Amino acid sequence: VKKTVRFGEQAAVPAIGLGTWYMGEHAAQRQQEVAALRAGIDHGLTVIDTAEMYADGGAEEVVGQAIRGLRDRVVLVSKVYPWHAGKAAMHRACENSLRRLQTDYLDMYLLHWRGDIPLQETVEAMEKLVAEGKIRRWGVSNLDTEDMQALWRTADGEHCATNQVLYHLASRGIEYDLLPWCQQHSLPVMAYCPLAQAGRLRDGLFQHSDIINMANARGITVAQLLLAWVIRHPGVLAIPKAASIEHVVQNAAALDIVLSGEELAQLDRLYPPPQRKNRLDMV
């Protein structure tokens, strides 16, 4: 079973990509960050996820340096603050992102979350960037099932190419409603915080005996086990962030893992799937 995802105008991207939140904050780390991204590309991870938010442009500048001369090898995803996502301001947000990335187009551009602009106006603005050639496709982030239904209802809202939401073993709420909805509409989901921020989100995911034993039993690390879990089913593209080369190399290698039913059942007993609607986890 191929560990790829149909994503925008790309027929198949690898199901693990590269996050950039917390890159670009410190000048002393820029070279290390550039190297971690290039390592990911060198290991076949092509999707890079960033945002105008991240270090106020800084992460985008890091990405732009990392991808110099490699633009055709990568699938670039950035995001626009909702307060920019309207007729007036959208072009400037997009143009500023493109300047920092030093590329003339994005593969995907996401509404970072839903603000006060009516969705119809954001959709029209995204469609204009598509017609101009500045973005190949648009999508959204942090939209729950109700918001996705509202979007679908808008003119051209069905062109939405992805929804990026929080998903990991210890926060599975999207499995009740949102993922099935996405699955029904052939919409790929981008899973952010797929490592729960290396466990910092949920106390003891990493420090868990049965998960530690399970990873040891196949000679993988817990992080790899958690990533393979996130991408176990089609239609989900995980975007772990790694500034460490050792970590990027691990993360790419998690594309080669096949979890058994026995293993997946054990994991469900440790962190059961949701049996009701849950508010969309975000962070």
Ligand SMILES: NC(=O)c1ccc[n+]([C@@H]2O[C@H](COP(=O)([O-])OP(=O)(O)OC[C@H]3O[C@@H](n4cnc5c(N)ncnc54)[C@H](OP(=O)(O)O)[C@@H]3O)[C@@H](O)[C@H]2O)c1
């Ligand atoms: N749309 C949104 O609202 C939203 C919100 C949050 C995040 N995001 C996106 O999603 C991405 C992923 O989420 P995240 O950065 O919040 O958290 P994450 O990817 O779940 O975890 C990042 C942490 O995991 C560590 N790590 C990575 N690979 C590892 C490995 N193999 N072994 C051990 N530790 C490992 C990293 O350390 P090192 O860096 O030192 O390797 C980092 O400290 C973000 O970077 C961003 O692109 C989007």
